[PDB]
Symmetry: C2
Subunit: 155 residues, 2 copies
């Protein structure tokens, strides 16, 4: 799908390895990943389906691309889960948001989230959640999100 | 598998419909759910797999019910969903969801036992971490289960 000022958004592809690992670095440690592992990863992500006239993908890994040079400007994913509560409802989980360093401050982060949400709600999610740091509560509030709890973790 | 005092933990089954909907109401709105809807839901949960490489089979959904052996009634339920990422070397992240302890079994320490088991399930699969969201009232409880504060949960409905 097309977006303004010459960027567009589409699902991630096997050939995105270099650029995606590069923009994900902004988020954390990505490590060594071989083209083969990646293709298997991408084929899993392209075949994993959520039992539901809709085809529902569990993983929806997006990259926003600068059409100018076909360079990945940002990536984000939304994972779909089917629960029992809410009449066997769907809950979306936005994960791994990263705006590439040379593309910061151009509004792409908010466009990416908007798209992930759109994707989640079209599938029928009764809600979409994500976790963030306090310093980013404001930003997600601008994307229409609300404070809803606390994130707990165990490594 | 078998827990202390006559309780045991296993994967949810199609026959668990009435009791689990009942204990989940403790959490929130469960709604109308036909036995057929449930079996297909159950069939999905028992078929959905997380791509590995090799010889251990990873289930995306791990819907557990702690059962009172005395009367085969569900004392509690919890689930840990398994996600595969690109970060952390195509890492695995566990996400604990929908924890509920049945009303007639509150205060028996089942909640903590349930959490401990989900964590074990996730770590055996290889998760580099396991996360969940909760209310501030329950931060203390999750701190006792070995979790630590990690961020803020945002939602949009």
């Amino acid at each position: 799908m097309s977006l303004p000022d010459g960027f567009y958004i589409r699902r991630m592809e096997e050939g995105d390895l270099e650029q995606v690992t590069e923009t994900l670095k902004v988020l954390t440690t990505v490590g060594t990943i071989t083209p083969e592992s990646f293709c298997k990863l991408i084929k899993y992500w392209n075949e994993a389906t959520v039992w539901n006239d809709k085809k529902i993908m569990q993983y929806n890994p997006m990259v926003i691309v600068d059409k100018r040079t076909e360079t990945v400007a940002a990536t984000g994913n939304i994972i779909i889960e089917r629960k029992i509560i809410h009449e066997l409802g769907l809950c979306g989980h936005i994960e791994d948001i990263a705006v590439n360093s040379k593309y910061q401050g151009q509004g792409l982060g908010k466009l990416l989230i908007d798209q992930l949400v759109t994707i989640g709600f079209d599938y029928g999610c009764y809600k979409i959640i994500l976790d963030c740091d306090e310093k980013n509560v404001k930003f997600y509030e601008k994307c229409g999100f609300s404070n809803a709890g606390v994130e707990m973790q165990i490594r």
